[PDB]
Amino acid sequence: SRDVLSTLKKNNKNTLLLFGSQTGTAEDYANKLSRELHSRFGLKTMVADFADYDWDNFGDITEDILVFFIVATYGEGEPTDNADEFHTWLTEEADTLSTLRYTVFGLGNSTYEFFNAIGRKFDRLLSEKGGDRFAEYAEGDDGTGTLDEDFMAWKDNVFDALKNDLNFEEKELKYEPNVKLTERDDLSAADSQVSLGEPNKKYINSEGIDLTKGPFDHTHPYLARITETRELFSSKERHCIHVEFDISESNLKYTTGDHLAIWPSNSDENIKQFAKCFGLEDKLDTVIELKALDSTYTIPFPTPITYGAVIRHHLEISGPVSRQFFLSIAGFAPDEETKKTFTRLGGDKQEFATKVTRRKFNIADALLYSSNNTPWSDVPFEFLIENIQHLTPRYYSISSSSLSEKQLINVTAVVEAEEEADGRPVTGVVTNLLKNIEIAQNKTGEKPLVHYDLSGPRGKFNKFKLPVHVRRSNFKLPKNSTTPVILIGPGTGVAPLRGFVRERVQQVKNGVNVGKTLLFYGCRNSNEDFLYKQEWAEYASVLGENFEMFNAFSRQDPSKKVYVQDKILENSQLVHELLTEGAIIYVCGDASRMARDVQTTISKIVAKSREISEDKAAELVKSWKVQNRYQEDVW
Ligand SMILES: Cc1cc2nc3c(=O)[nH]c(=O)nc-3n(C[C@H](O)[C@H](O)[C@H](O)COP(=O)(O)OP(=O)(O)OC[C@H]3O[C@@H](n4cnc5c(N)ncnc54)[C@H](O)[C@@H]3O)c2cc1C
């Protein structure tokens, strides 16, 4: 079953699309491309997760299979978890791939140093080992906001290659469903086999199954009770939530520095606007059953299920709208005046960006703009199941210590929310869910901007439970507790660093010899947004002279805006002294600006302190990253 070649043949497929994805974008692109290849070119396509196959025989792939690799870069130039075994195979075991025909699209972000390392590496190694690159490599940049249009441009070039180099006939895009829906008017919420949004089918049967026992992963979460929450900012307009999850009654395990994945549900406001857009407002309790029309299509949620459960618990209805979604759905436009507007917007990259993307429209808002509020009632709900990405967990840096509190997981989440001039709320799904929980749990009297179902499917999320799982990270304290560490994490970057500090505090209490800990923190104003302000002196009391903390306030004084890199420079003698003692550097938080400014500042310190050029020092600091002496948890 893990032989991909045998799987292609058995399913009568001639086209393989492989996705390396951590948060689902690469998977969604592979699905989008697959459907278009099938409709426009008649290709018999299979979308595959690298993790579902073993790769030892892949060198035997035949010339009649076209392979598309859609691959994200993660961590520090590393493969996505699902692609790790393929990456080990290609880099270490693969010999030749003499009849492979392939093309690669990389997903990455140019604010990271190893930009699109994986797409570039796959594309190069596949060629070096004898593969035939049939369409040029291209890559997308999530750091500058061009990723989606980069993908569209690459896809256009792939289609040119198919049509003009391989002489395939290209037909017009048409919706060719891979799934069939049937309404079950005989079923209702009263029927226990009907999903009301449970995370998977194990949560629907579960009469005498232990839902507290292992293992928990991206296919199977633990419903973790939130025992307490706290608003950490004093600002009325900007919020950050401390969350404590009780895991004591379960086999869910974590280690300091790991990530918690929180499984979302959508807000009432976004659901309402989605149902209005598609004429589903009187159908939300109606039960549907889904059947695959293609032997390699996996229905992405339990069936049977209600429309409302699919929309609330399974579809990523919010977020930037791909122009490819406009192109795919245009055939279902409700009327001619709409089709004219919608076809124009879908075909013009720049006007799409101005009229849809920069307004931060969700699907529902963009389609209703285009149709002057006429519902898109001709859109088959199957089309939406296939063309909107599955609602994916968000990761949080755990802020508790597994040594100190093995039975609790903390996270520290800044809430993303704004209102547009036209009154629309533009919200982060998970973070507004956590804010709603904090408001309700603490009876705060704040009015939530958007609202969620805090009880969940059949009341199964009651007493403020959410589905979670833990992802193991390589962001880890040194094996040797006497090794000094330098911890840099302004804003929510402090989250894993709180975990680290709490671990070292407990270690000192366990009579362990712990090395020096230097922490560089920053926020706007000591009286506004200083995370965990009270705790740090308590930690200092335990750790003694083996802990020093320096704080940078960016807004306290307008004449002197101060950031963590300014405090690192001010304390350069100490920082470098610790580096000479083998200190490990950990940088956490904002990838876009902070991480790069900090790295530059550290490089300058190394250059001055060691009498080497700035570029030689920069290259040395880069080698520390490769060697895991300089670690990042930046997003
Ligand atoms: C390894 C890792 C560790 C992390 N650690 C932490 C941490 O410790 N703490 C923390 O706070 N975060 C952390 N994050 C970030 C976190 O995973 C989330 O990305 C963040 O909390 C936002 O999630 P959300 O569901 O609220 O927002 P999302 O729903 O993903 O929305 C993202 C943004 O898009 C905006 N938006 C919504 N709709 C639209 C639209 N139509 N057009 C344009 N924009 C729109 C939202 O308002 C928001 O600003 C980490 C990320 C990673 C990868």
Ligand SMILES: Cc1cc2nc3c(=O)[nH]c(=O)nc-3n(C[C@H](O)[C@H](O)[C@H](O)COP(=O)(O)O)c2cc1C
């Ligand atoms: C924690 C983290 C680390 C990342 N590391 C890199 C990197 O080293 N190089 C890069 O080009 N992009 C990097 N990215 C950008 C992702 O590849 C990019 O957001 C991509 O679109 C995600 O695709 P996915 O949703 O399929 O996982 C990183 C993103 C995150 C969140």
